[PDB]
């Protein structure tokens, strides 16, 4: 049988089928031409002919149907900016008239657009200001006049809020029936700019300098304000009043972040604020006052969330999930033993009640009805790298049902879920350890309705390939279980010695040992090159409690590095590893850890590859870096900021073969970071291999560059292993 070759990986010879649906109601979903499916019976009818927009004249990047099904928003001229942000053009098509709307069009270069949650109002951001359309074909109402490129952002995030706080460009939040539009405003006036060249097509005679407001660690941060406007009022001198809700006094005393916005009712919004020292967070719960038209946050309804051992949240304070009446909410919180569990709050009582407990964690709350809360956790079989859907009875917390554990326990140990609008149906998505499996279920009695996609065609194809296998297991260190996985070559033989590649990420709350089925570079390395590809979750890794997660607090570049080295020693002791052929590689945080390990002097590793590494924490952005590292000042944590750089280890790279790779247009981990590694290596006379990727960003993900980088790394590894 053939093996899984590099060309198979790079050409996507063997494709995972998906089943990506969009719920439009409690019982229908859209699926791609466009069909609408009835969840209960599985029958479909054609929702939008794949010929409808043949003559449209543009390629349509995406669509979005209004909640009342009356209009479809068509996105085209898509132009990517950062991880989530982009600009696009939009047309609106009227589904009753079968007419495109040609009047009062959304402008070109629109930065964000969203329907109201009911009806068909639109809110959009253009040139950094917010506009509202009550009707798709009528004029917009301007909401803000302060928008200013790179300086004032209304309703959209700046770079660091996009990447590290909201994971979204959008900073607009409609109230549930669409009366109110809440939004944040960011002021980057004094935030320094990262500047880097962009070369563009070769016809561009002068390179272009990209300038992005980007606060590196300890620098001046954007400031933020929060506003709510009543869009039903757009009957006042066209000038609706934006009512500010100010941060609490405990936040205003210093630098802070707005880190969560969640509406609770039509007239009640909750906001969470986080101090720049991210171990103290405050939730305000604010009610509309009909008589004054203002928003009041009763101090009795304020909730404090703080951490004595670390930062707050996995990456930020968790979202609340409110009961329908808005008088109570559920929220994932670290319990007294350090494990993240669901706590039940009354809005005006400070003590919450944990409704789950144990030596495992809740991953997320997925749906809440009058009777049940549904959540994903890694409880099943005590496997932190597995994921299952559970439902807990709100009137009796001792009644907890695992909805997914036993559906196919051999094939399916990693689930996510997508519920319909009022949770009357749910799609389960199993992603491993076998082939992904998508199924539909009815919540009324948790019956499997039908298999949506089982990947049987890919199964048949893979049967003719010498696929690697995957072992997921643990080693005990200091009476603590630490999980690892190995991608093992086909016909793996414990009596033989294999080269081993340690595939590292190891950032705070990371998890590289899990039950997910992947087809990736490691699949090729194991299948064709007979390399064991191993990953290990040491101190700092996620989903196993705060004692493990917070072990690297204020100390990035220490234990999570040491534990990758120890893991390699442990794997060598297993007897199937050629200890003369151990390599290490990783991307981003993984390139940082790879580099730290290669500079450690441990002698364990022959060679390694760092792709877009962090090299010095003062080069990375404030929100992420300070969360773990505090401030780079003599009074706080400067000594460890300066002790944890790659460059200070340059001399030790004389012991190893290193390949350093970075895209020149990386807005996230700046090319600067690898520019300083290479300069430090040159300064101590260390030879190494290098590759820049012109105009590639942090993902080095254009089609050609993706192929080029994995080809180049494959050559390096094979050379290192005398393959």
């Amino acid at each position: 049988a053939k093996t899984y070759t590099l060309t198979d990986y790079l050409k996507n010879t063997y494709r995972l089928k998906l089943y990506s649906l969009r719920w439009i109601s409690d019982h229908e979903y859209l699926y791609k031409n466009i069909l609408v499916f009835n969840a209960e019976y599985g029958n479909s009818s054609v929702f939008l002919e794949n010929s409808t927009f043949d003559e449209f004249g543009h390629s349509i990047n995406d669509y979005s149907i209004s909640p009342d099904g009356q209009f479809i928003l068509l996105e085209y001229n898509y132009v990517k900016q950062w991880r989530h942000s982009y600009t696009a053009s939009y047309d609106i098509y009227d589904l009753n008239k079968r007419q495109l709307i040609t009047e009062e069009r959304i402008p070109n270069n629109t930065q964000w657009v969203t329907w109201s949650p009911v009806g068909h109002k639109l809110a959009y951001v253009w040139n950094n200001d917010i506009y509202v359309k009550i009707e798709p074909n009528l004029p917009s109402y301007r909401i803000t006049w302060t928008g200013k490129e790179d300086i004032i952002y209304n309703g959209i995030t700046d770079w660091v809020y996009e990447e590290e706080v909201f994971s979204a460009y959008s900073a607009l939040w409609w109230s549930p029936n669409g009366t109110f539009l809440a939004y944040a405003q960011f002021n980057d006036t004094e935030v320094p700019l990262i500047e880097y060249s962009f070369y563009s097509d070769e016809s561009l005679q002068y390179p272009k300098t990209v300038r992005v407001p980007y606060p590196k660690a300890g620098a001046v941060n954007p400031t933020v304000k929060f506003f709510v406007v009543n869009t039903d009022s757009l009957s006042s001198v066209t000038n609706a009043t934006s009512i500010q809700i100010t941060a609490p006094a405990s936040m205003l005393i210093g630098d802070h972040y707005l880190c969560d916005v969640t509406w609770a009712t039509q007239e009640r919004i909750s906001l969470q604020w986080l101090r720049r020292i991210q171990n103290y967070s405050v939730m305000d719960i604010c009610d509309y006052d009909e008589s004054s038209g203002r928003w009041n946050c009763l101090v009795a309804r304020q909730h404090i969330e703080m951490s004595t051992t670390g930062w707050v949240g996995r990456f930020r304070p968790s979202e609340p999930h409110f009961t329908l009446d808005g008088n109570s909410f559920y929220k994932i919180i670290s319990n007294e033993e350090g494990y993240r569990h669901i706590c039940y709050f009354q809005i005006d009582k400070k003590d919450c009640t944990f409704i789950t407990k144990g030596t495992w964690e809740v991953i997320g709350i997925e749906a809440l009805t009058s009777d049940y809360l549904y959540y994903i956790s890694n409880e099943y079989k005590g496997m932190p790298g597995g994921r299952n859907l559970y439902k807990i009875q709100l009137s009796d917390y001792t009644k907890v049902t695992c909805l997914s554990c036993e559906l196919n326990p051999e094939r399916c140990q990693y689930y996510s879920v997508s519920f319909s609008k009022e949770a009357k149906y749910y799609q389960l998505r199993c992603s491993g350890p076998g082939l992904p499996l998508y199924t539909l279920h009815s919540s009324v009695n948790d019956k499997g309705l039908r298999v949506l996609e089982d990947n049987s065609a890919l199964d048949k194809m893979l049967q003719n390939v010498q696929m690697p296998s995957k072992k997921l297991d643990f080693i005990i260190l200091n009476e603590t279980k630490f999980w690892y996985q190995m991608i093992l070559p086909p016909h793996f033989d414990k009596s033989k010695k294999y080269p081993l590649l340690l595939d590292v990420y190891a950032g705070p709350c990371s998890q590289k040992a899990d039950t997910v089925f992947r087809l990736n570079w490691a699949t090729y390395l194991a299948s064709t090159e007979n390399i064991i590809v191993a990953s290990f979750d040491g101190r700092g890794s996620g989903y196993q409690g705060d004692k493990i997660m917070h072990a690297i607090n204020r100390r990035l570049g220490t234990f999570e590095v040491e534990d990758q080295i120890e893991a390699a020693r442990q794997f060598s002791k297993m007897g199937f590893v050629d200890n003369k052929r151990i390599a290490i590689w990783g991307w981003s945080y993984g390139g940082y850890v790879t580099s730290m390990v290669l500079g450690s002097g441990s002698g364990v590793f022959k060679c390694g590859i760092a792709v877009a590494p962090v090299s010095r924490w003062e080069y990375y952005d404030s929100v992420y870096t300070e969360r773990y590292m505090g401030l780079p000042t003599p009074e706080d944590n400067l000594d460890h900021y300066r002790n944890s750089t790659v460059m200070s280890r340059a001399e030790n790279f004389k012991q190893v073969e290193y390949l350093l790779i970075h895209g020149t247009a990386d807005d996230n981990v700046h090319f600067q970071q690898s520019a300083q590694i290479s300069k430090a290596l040159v300064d101590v006379g260390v030879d190494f291999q290098a590759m820049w990727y012109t105009d590639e960003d942090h993902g080095i993900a254009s089609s050609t560059a993706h192929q080029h980088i994995y080809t180049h790394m494959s050559h390096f590894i094979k050379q290192c292993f005398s393959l």
Partner: peptide, 4 residues
């Protein structure tokens, strides 16, 4: 997030 330092991740691709």
């Amino acid at each position: 997030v330092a991740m691709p």
